[PDB]
């Protein structure tokens, strides 16, 4: 239902959420935020829960 994301980056740190009908489905839109921002690193999620992180 609800995800979130945490930027672990550099300089650029903060979070969101995303309403994704599947895991899947979601990290797709999560490529596009960081990349718009020029933020690049690791994404990893576990199915249990629903947080994601980018360390650059």
Same mark, same amino acid.
């Given at each position: 239902?609800?995800?979130?994301?945490?930027?672990?980056?550099?300089?650029?740190? *903060?979070?969101?959420? %995303?309403? =994704?009908? #599947? !895991?899947?489905? !979601?990290?797709? =839109?999560?490529?596009?935020? =960081?990349?718009?921002? *020029?933020? #690049?690193?690791?994404?990893?999620?576990?199915? !249990? %829960?629903? %947080?994601?992180?980018?360390?650059?």
């Amino acid at each position: 239902m609800q995800y979130k994301l945490v930027i672990n980056g550099k300089t650029l740190k *903060g979070e969101t959420t %995303t309403k =994704a009908v #599947d !895991a899947e489905t !979601a990290e797709k =839109a999560f490529k596009q935020y =960081a990349n718009d921002n *020029g933020v #690049d690193g690791v994404w990893t999620y576990d199915d !249990a %829960t629903k %947080t994601f992180t980018v360390t650059e």
